[PDB]
Amino acid sequence: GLMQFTLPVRLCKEIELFHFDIGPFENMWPGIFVYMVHRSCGTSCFELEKLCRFIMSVKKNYRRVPYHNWKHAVTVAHCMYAILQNNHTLFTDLERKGLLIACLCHDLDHRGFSNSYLQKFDHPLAALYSTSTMEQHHFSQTVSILQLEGHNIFSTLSSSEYEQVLEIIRKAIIATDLALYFGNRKQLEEMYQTGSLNLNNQSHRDRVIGLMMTACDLCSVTKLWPVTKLTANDIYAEFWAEGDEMKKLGIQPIPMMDRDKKDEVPQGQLGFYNAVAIPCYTTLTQILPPTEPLLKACRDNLSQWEKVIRGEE
Template sequence: MLQCLALYIGALCHDLDHRGKNNKFMLDTESPLAAIYSTSTMEHHHFNQTVTILQQAIAMTASDLSASSKPWDIQVETVKVIFEEFYQQGDAERAAGRIPIPMMDRNQPDQQPSSQVGFLTGICVPCYTLLDSLIP
């Protein structure tokens, strides 16, 4: 299934935003794209256009949220790491004289459960529901 999805995305993105000219023409005419991509001008352009679209696409968000779709024991360990990162930011904010938001305040660990429930129900479930409707 993963290979099929990769091939599908590759097929969609092949020659994305093709300008009707080859790499040599782009270099010889000093096109703006050739100034950005000095080798394999159009291939680099197609790839970067693809990345730009994927960053807007729901699939990038779903990948970012993927820990929430893992088995519970793995998800629990991931959440510990994420909250430690949040707490370190909260510590840095407190050291800078700021008040961290409750989720990033290690002095308020009771905020973790409601934060996770809100994250799962408000962000993860809608994201994966949409992704499932787009790519069943």
Template sequence: MSLFMYRQRNGIAELTTRIFNIVYPLNTGIDSLFSDFDMVAVMMTVNKIGAPHFTAQDEEVKYLNFANLVLRGFHLSYLHNCETRRGQVLFWSASKVFYEFTDIERQFHKALYTIQLLFLKLLDGSFQTHMHCCYNNPPADQWALVSGLPTYVAENGLICNIMNAAEDKLFDFQKEPLDESGWTIKNVLSLPIVNKEKIVGVATFYIRKNGKPFDDMDETLMESLTQFLGWSVLNTDTYDKMNKLENRKDIFQDMVMYHVKCRKDVIQNILNTREVYDKEPDECDEDELDDILVKHKKIHTIFEFHFCDFKFSELDLVKCGIKMYYELSVVDKFHIPRDVSDNGNSNPTGDLKRYYTDLETMAMVTAGLCHDIDHRGTNNPYQMKSGNPLAKLHGSSILERHHLEFGKALLRDEALSIYQNLNGRQHETVIYLMDIAIIATDLALYFKKRTMFQKIVDQSKTYESLDSWTKYMMYETTRKEIVMATMMTACDLSAIAKPWEIQSGVVRRCRILGQGDLERTVLEQQPIPMMDRNKADELPKLQCGFIDFVCSFVYKEFSLLHSEITLMLERTGRSGTL
């Protein structure tokens, strides 16, 4: 007796015997209608013992139902083994799909040990092998492509299961051994890899380990496996794109640094140490460099409230920025390199320095220098309306976060970093404080924090002396950060408290009307009245409203906290009445 299993391949029913290893397709002349029931197998008996032929009674043997039960049990066991194996392969694949991003071959090499796999990636209509060679007309040594099977699968999106590759008439498989070991193609299973209805590759499996043809369970398993192969294509492509973007970013950053860095000969225009001391800036001590800055009398006006930078050259402003670090006495204390230069302005402290350490004040001054670096001349809402990439990169406080990241990028450069000699804890602290200080220049955040600042001011009045209040504040990190954030807002708006000729000059230099023109012409939108050139006659009234609602409140609360800032409040009120 022989047992024939019933199965389907490529949608065609067939019988196969595990005893003789023979397959009979049912579409080649054999009657396909055997039973009205779900057929799982066929039993065949030959050469009846003791009789010349089988009778009708033989057809109704009583043990047939029992044999049917055994066959069904065997079939269920077979399905169970297939599903178990499928689960093992898919579970292993799922655990490895995100493990290796660089090479898809390495992802599935171990998982597919029962077959030999060739993965072909479809790239711009051509096939790309794991060796990263693209072929439109493959050479003879690329036997998998020469057969035409991957191309057929990619074009038609069909699953092809070939039982006997050597006798197949549709595809031209090489019949001779493919290598010195004598490896030949016997049977093939090829499937498309689909991503959102788009074929991105073809996975072709050659020769089962037991040498038998692939069956319908193999097709189901491999069809599921191609989903992981598709994810792997996505992962490796994404990884490759990320690497390219990272390389482009590094190139762009190098280009920016090339134009931003100050050359050593330019540094001598600021700190002419070669002429005075016959040595480089990094070889001079703090007193020697301070003496060079003292000789520039114009720089001393930085300590006066009416300081105005309009008449200063860029190099003079750099000297002012350097002078601030010497005024804080942090150059030697934190070993700031002498040949690092920066640009910036200065503002009086109003005795608020008493709350902060030297490290914290250095972080705040650096944040002040970086808080508007690489400004685009437009505000945050314009970045969002225009679809600027910065708006996509930073969800809120768009320009402030750009200034912060740009400043950090400069400070990461060894030739520009003034923090390079800080220890790990100090470096972490100054970067954290810079984050708070620069982001605080977003007025939208100021309105959220000013109630908290008011409570701090009210609390200060409950202390008997300034010294006791100072001791309390020095250890209140959160309150210090709120005061620092409000200080950044006050400094950012400080032009309003300057003498009239200075603040009017600052206003004339603002490009708010220019942004209004851009909104009207480029975005085809109506700008807000303060930026609308057609409503310039309303500008004084709008500015007075801004002074009263925003500026006056800041300086009023600070003057209650420290009387030294009362002068700024008085000048702000005077500006609103001019």
């Protein structure tokens, strides 16, 4: 356990920042994830052999899709790292362990299609899981990999603690269902502004961790413009593919997913920042003040999309 990971000086330094890009070198991401766990949790949190073999099974079970891929998993785990390191007294030992694993696992075996498409296709996963279809599958796959021989990174926990960490991971991953985000933030907004928000109330912590999960999962919109711009291409390649598949069921897809309507994207991103991203990072900053850079960076990109619409870029 005297074996720490060290990154090159630039990554060692930039990794602490919310807007850190994990780069185009796939083979460095596992070491980036381990480095983050060792700093955020401790070198003793996870047996290195088991963690390494858990990370590569998770990697194996992410698909070669444009966006909902292994790079998204590590990118969302990093944002969670950045939140935990900037608020380090606010979270228990079990939450620091569970939430970085929850972020790595949150989109396991994603095919690049929405819960809606599964439903209209009548996918078997939609029969098994009536709401949060993909997100219940993702948790299912997380438990599957935890129960592979030699992959139980939580072996040293007690019966109680183990059940608590798997319950943290479950709620964490279910919250990545953006349909539940809108009601969760509203409740949080009320609780905060009436002064009834209480982080000793387990049902309140759940809600806050829920918002943190939405904030990490949307964190591509908190990157420097050139990263956010190029990530949007990957996100939209999935949306257009799903639109194609909708048209193949004989359903006209919403404009967002229609590749014939690419000209409507800059307005559609405006809608998304205002209705989803800005509110998310606003309420997050109100609750967790040190997370303010995510809101600042998100606003900067909103401003850059406004520029696109005016044909300034």
